[PDB]
Amino acid sequence: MSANRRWWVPPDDEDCVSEKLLRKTRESPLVPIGLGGCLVVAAYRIYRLRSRGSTKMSIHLIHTRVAAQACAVGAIMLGAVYTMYSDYVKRMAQDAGEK
Numbered sequence: 001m002s003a004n005r006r007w008w009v010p011p012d013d014e015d016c017v018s019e020k021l022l023r024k025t026r027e028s029p030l031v032p033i034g035l036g037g038c039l040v041v042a043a044y045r046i047y048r049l050r051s052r053g054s055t056k057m058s059i060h061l062i063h064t065r066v067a068a069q070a071c072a073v074g075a076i077m078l079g080a081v082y083t084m085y086s087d088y089v090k091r092m093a094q095d096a097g098e099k
Contacts, residue, residue, distance in 0.1 A: 030084055037077050044070040 012018075047053075048070070061067060
């Protein structure tokens with residue numbers, strides 16, 4: 001015991017897949033996992049958008065807990081989701097609409 005000790009600083013953009021997401025995955029569909037993350041995300045969304053909580057002591061929105069968590073998590077989750085929801089497309093050559 002000295003002072004936390006241990007540290008790390010990856011070059012990649014705050015990591016991405018790696019063995020982490022490698023084991024994280026599984027097989028289950030996104031319909032479920034997604035839906036859930038939708039209720040959570042959306043929830044957190046409507047929350048931030050709306051003015052609820054009843055605290056009156058946070059006119060910064062940065063040094064929080066559930067907010068910061070929703071920010072980070074939300075970022076990850078969302079990011080992933082988006083990538084998926086969008087990836088849903090065939091795979092490439094998205095030339096929709098006719099001019």
